[PDB]
Structures are given as structure tokens and as C-alpha cells.
Design a protein around this ligand. Structure first.
Ligand code: MET
Length: 531
């Protein structure tokens, strides 16, 4: 089936200013989308803010201003942050959006008409901070804003409160068997595999029904009224997850504003999501609740959920209160935007909780970006080595030559598979293995000596090196969007050859193609010292 490739980030709570986690989640969403665009597919990448709920309402009361004003301000900080980060997200959705509210009421009504919503009670623990229902097994003793004996979440250490309310209940218990068939029928639907095994384990045990409304007073009336019952507000998470459906139904003008909400998702060809990017902390909502609502509603399920780990800086937890900040915009202004993105995507894979340090950041920048990639691009474009500033016509290939060409021919297929898992770390590693090999070959052939000893041999070496750099750069273009463009400009690659699977093939740029012009004292990535 040919559709718009639909990739999403979570929509983030606006209780506080944007930080590394949100930037990271959205970066992953952005990269996946960028990769599919270079394959020449239609893409719709979505991000946004989760604006209702007790959490956010209470954060706005502590700042002493109205929820409308608070949400709008912090939403503006998220937008500015994501604009500053230089993503290519197609739409930014806000749950306060009036068209989103409409979609929630449709979905709610669908679940009701299906017989999957009844009036009951929830008597149990709740984490306001995580907007999450918890069982006694998932709580323990801790301390509060005072240092008094309270209870807290085992998942996140946030304070939990006991809740005893008449609530509308969704019949989650009835979807155990269908969710299990879904996980087994699609054994790559949740990534990484161990997180997938976690979900199955939990659903195997049993599922209780889920509260999907709350008494209106508890939410400080900052939520979507339940259709036909204004005493209840819709569960912030049922509201939030619906953003994926809403976004799938919004037509967006060139400027980025929503102009229209279609009746049927099939109209825009986006739903269901091909990949939901999320953090491990919200897996249950996406892998258990969401598919269950969708099955209830008769809507198609997503194809993949990819769930990633948390970040630390210098092996310490990130918190401005604890005196350990990690400002991405600041670190990007220092070391470069593409470099920072590279590091975040290279340093840790999804199954791990990565660790930033200035030490390790400078090591990768210098080692991989400058010494391996940058160095190689300057060599094959240098006036010393490439005396005509053109793509030379290759002569006969040696066996060594071919060993390298084979690695390059194989690289796209391999990088492709990793991008589609998705496993961006392994895609990057694959590309740089090929880059290390090209460097080894260039050291080995010593083209600088060939300039005078064997010009005919130089043509071959130089052509392979150029083509290896082009192909590796193309495949890195979702990771280094701006730098890939500089590289292609230096290689003088025509625009048409900078995307499309046609240009994954070795030899797509003809000999005779002219290099771009040099600039006095230019460098791709410049090295930073070890303080
Ligand atoms: C439907 S994704 C909701 C995610 C939630 N607002 C968070 O910040 O964790």
C-alpha cells in the first residue's frame, strides 16, 4: 500500500520549559522522517504539546496565571526551541486546538457506541506528575516537597495520591486477547525487542479496565468535557493519544498553520502511524491503551512503536535544582547543530540510557566528524590531489579497488534496513565503517604521491574516493542535514542527485562533473581542544 509515511513524536506536557528529552525524542522523529524524504517518499512528521490536565493546570497555578496564558506561553517556548534546533517537522499540534477537541469527542462517542465505556469507580493510586494510574505493587515509601513520609511511584519517584471517584471506565480487560494476537502477529511492532517482551509480559498477566474520565473539579476544569456529561472531563491521556489521529486529519498551509479538519483519515493517507517515537516512560500508554482504543473504535493500528532511554550528563541526573544542566541549544551553539545531533544519535542506541560529557562530545567531533569524515572530504577536493577540480574518469579497477566499491554498493541496503527498524545508531555506525575503509584505502594508495608518479592511477583512486564520500554523505544527510549540503556543494553534486533511491547506486554522478569552488580557510568540522 502506497501512503504518506507518518512519523510522530510524543506531544509534551507544558508544565515546564523544554529540555533535552523533548529535543531528543523530536530529533529521532525528525531523522526518520528526513530519511524517508531522501528515499523520495511522501512524509508527514508530527510533534506538539499536551496541554490539558491536573499536572499542567497545577503548574499554572504555581506560576500564578491562567491556564490559557500559561499553556500558550510554554507552547511558544517549545516551538521556538524546535525552530532553533533546525528540524523539518511538518506540523506542531496543540491539544488546546479546537479541531483536536472535536476529534476527541468523535473518538469518545465511537468507544461509547461500541459498548466499551461504562460508569464505574476508580479507587486507587495515581501519579499526577505522570498522569498515571498505579497499582500498590508499583508504589513505595518516599518524601515530598516537605520531607514527610508520603508514597511515590516506583516508575518515576513522583508523589502519588489516593483517588476515589465515580469515573467513566474503558473496558480494557476485554482487549487482552486481541492485543496479544497483535504483538505476536507483528513481532517487530515494538522496538527494541526487550521492551516488546516487557509489554507482552504485562498483558499476559491481565488487564484491569481503565478510567477514561475524571470529576471536573479535580481537573480544575482544564480538560475536554465528556460528551453528554459535563460533570466529567476526559482523561488527559485519551485526549493526548488522540493527537496522532487528529494530526492525521489536518490540512496544513505552506506557513505551518492548520486550515481544515477532514472527516475521514483515508482522505490524507497518513493514519495509522508508521512509527510512533516515544520514551520508555510512556510505553504502556502507546503499546497497550492506544491499540485498545483503536481496536474498540475500528481504526487501524500503528506499524511500529520505538521506545528510547533517558539521558544523563557526567553520569549524574539532569536537573536545574540539583545543579547539573544540559542545554542543547547552548551545546549546539558551541560545538555545532549537526555535530550535537550526531552525538545524540551515535552515543547511545535506544535500548540504553546515554551519557553526555564535553570530553566524549569532543572525542566524537574530533575523531569521527573531523578526522574521519571532514578530513576525507578535504582530501578528495584538495587542489593538491584533485588538480582539475573535477570528477575524474576511472581507469581499470584493481581487486583492492573493487573490495572498496563493494562496501559502498552494499552500504545503502544495510543503512536502509537499520533506518527502518528503526536503529539510527547502527545506521550511523554502518556508514562510518565505510568511511573508515575509504580512509584506509586513501592512506594505502597515497594519491598525493600518485599526482606525479601515476596520473592514470590517480583518476581511479580519486573517483572511488569521491563516489564513496558522496554515497556515505547522502545516507548521513538525515543526521547532518546542513553539513551534508556543504559537502555536496564542495563535491559539486547536482541537486537532482542529492535524493532519490536512484542515487543510492554507485556511479550516479558522471565523470566530468565539476567541483564547487574553494573558500579561504574553510573547514567542515573544526577540532576542539581537551580542557
Ligand atoms: C500522547 S504522548 C503524551 C506524552 C506526555 N504528555 C509526556 O510528556 O510524557
Amino acid at each position: 500500500v502506497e501512503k504518506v509515511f507518518f512519523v510522530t513524536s510524543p506531544i509534551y506536557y507544558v508544565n515546564a520549559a523544554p529540555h533535552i528529552g523533548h529535543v531528543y525524542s523530536t530529533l529521532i522523529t525528525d531523522v526518520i522522517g528526513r530519511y524517508h524524504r531522501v528515499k523520495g517518499e511522501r512524509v508527514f512528521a508530527l510533534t506538539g504539546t499536551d496541554e490539558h490536565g491536573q499536572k499542567v493546570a497545577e503548574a499554572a497555578k504555581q506560576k500564578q496565571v491562567s491556564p490559557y496564558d500559561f499553556t500558550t506561553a510554554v507552547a511558544g517556548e517549545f516551538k521556538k526551541c524546535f525552530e532553533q534546533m533546525d528540524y523539518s517537522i511538518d506540523y506542531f499540534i496543540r491539544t488546546t486546538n479546537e479541531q483536536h477537541k472535536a476529534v476527541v469527542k468523535e473518538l469518545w462517542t465511537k468507544l461509547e457506541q461500541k459498548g466499551d465505556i461504562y460508569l464505574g469507580r476508580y479507587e486507587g493510586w495515581y501519579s499526577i506528575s505522570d498522569e498515571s494510574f498505579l497499582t500498590p505493587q508499583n508504589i513505595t515509601d518516599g518524601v515530598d516537597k516537605d520531607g514527610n513520609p508520603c508514597k511515590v511511584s516506583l516508575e518515576s519517584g513522583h508523589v502519588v495520591t489516593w483517588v476515589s471517584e465515580e469515573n467513566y471506565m474503558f473496558r480494557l480487560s476485554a482487549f487482552r486477547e486481541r492485543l496479544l494476537e497483535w504483538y505476536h502477529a507483528n513481532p517487530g511492532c515494538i522496538v527494541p525487542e526487550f521492551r516488546r517482551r516487557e509489554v507482552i509480559r504485562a498483558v499476559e498477566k491481565g488487564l484491569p479496565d481503565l478510567s477514561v474520565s475524571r470529576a471536573r473539579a479535580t481537573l480544575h476544569n482544564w480538560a475536554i468535557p465528556v460528551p453528554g456529561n459535563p460533570d466529567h472531563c476526559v482523561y488527559v491521556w485519551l485526549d493526548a493519544l488522540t493527537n496522532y489521529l487528529t494530526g492525521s486529519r489536518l490540512r496544513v498551509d505552506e506557513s505551518g498553520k492548520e486550515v481544515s479538519l477532514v472527516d475521514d483519515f483515508n482522505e490524507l493517507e497518513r493514519f495509522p502511524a508508521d512509527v510512533h517515537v516515544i520514551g520508555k516512560d510512556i510505553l504502556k500508554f502507546h503499546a497497550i491503551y492506544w491499540p485498545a482504543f483503536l481496536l474498540s473504535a475500528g481504526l487501524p493500528l500503528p506499524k511500529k512503536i520505538v521506545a528510547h532511554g533517558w539521558w544523563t550528563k557526567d553520569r549524574k541526573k539532569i536537573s536545574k535544582s540539583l545543579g547539573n544542566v544540559f542545554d542543547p541549544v547552548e551545546k549546539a551553539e558551541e560545538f555545532g547543530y549537526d555535530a550535537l545531533k550526531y552525538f545524540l544519535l551515535r552515543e547511545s542506541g535506544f535500548s540504553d540510557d546515554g551519557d553526555y560529557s564535553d570530553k566524549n562530545m569532543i572525542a566524537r567531533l574530533n575523531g569521527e566528524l573531523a578526522d574521519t569524515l571532514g578530513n576525507l572530504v578535504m582530501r578528495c577536493t584538495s587542489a593538491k590531489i584533485n588538480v582539475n577540480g573535477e570528477w575524474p574518469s576511472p581507469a581499470a579497477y584493481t581487486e583492492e579497488d573493487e573490495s572498496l566499491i563493494q562496501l559502498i554498493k552494499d552500504l545503502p541496503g544495510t543503512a536502509d534496513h537499520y533506518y527502518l527498524i528503526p536503529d539510527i545508531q547502527k545506521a550511523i555506525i554502518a556508514v562510518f565503517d565505510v568511511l573508515r575503509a575509504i580512509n584506509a584505502y586513501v592512506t594505502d594508495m597515497a594519491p598525493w604521491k600518485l599526482v606525479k608518479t601515476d596520473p592514470e592511477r590517480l583518476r581511479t583512486v580519486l573517483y572511488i574516493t569521491l563516489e564513496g564520500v558522496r554515497v556515505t554523505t547522502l545516507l548521513l544527510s538525515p543526521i547532518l542535514p546542513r553539513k551534508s549540503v556543504v559537502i555536496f556543494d564542495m563535491l559539486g553534486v547536482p541537486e537532482v542527485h542529492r535524493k532519490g533511491i536512484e542515487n543510492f547506486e554507485f556511479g550516479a554522478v558522471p565523470p566530468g562533473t565539476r567541483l564547487g569552488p574553494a573558500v579561504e580557510g574553510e573547514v567542515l568540522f573544526s577540532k576542539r581542544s581537551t580542557e
